[PDB]
Homo-oligomer: A and B are copies of this chain.
Amino acid sequence: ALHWRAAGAATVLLVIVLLAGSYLAVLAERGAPGAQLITYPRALWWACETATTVXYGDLCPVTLWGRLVAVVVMVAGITSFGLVTAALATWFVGREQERRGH
């Protein structure tokens, strides 16, 4: 099934974005005075709460590239969760047509 295939592809891609985003955020934020997103472990946590939209506000990017990385994490997170929902819709719709006799 395509909907379950694209969903799985979205989840694995999300994990890649989370890891890479955690790596790129630190690389981008270091060098800017006052930045807190400068260590990998908490950067990964930041990526999670960002991708899930959430955004406690305990950690936030202050640089241009750190914020661009953030946007990518947001979109990847929203798209994946939106794709899972879309996949769940197809499963339920296809199932309802079966118990109806259509």
Contact = CB atoms under 8 A, between A and B. Distances in A.
Contact of A85 (B60, B86, B91): B86
Given A53-B53, A75-B52, A89-B89, A1 B58 contact: no
Interface of A: 1-3, 6, 41, 45, 48-49, 52-53, 55-58, 60, 64, 67, 70-71, 74-75, 78-79, 81-97, 99-100, 102
Given A81-B82, A95-B3, A52 B67 contact: no
A45 B67 contact: yes
Contact of A49 (B49, B52, B55, B99): B55
10 contacts: A1-B99, A45-B67, A48-B74, A52-B78, A56-B60, A87-B92, A89-B90, A90-B92, A90-B93, A93-B93
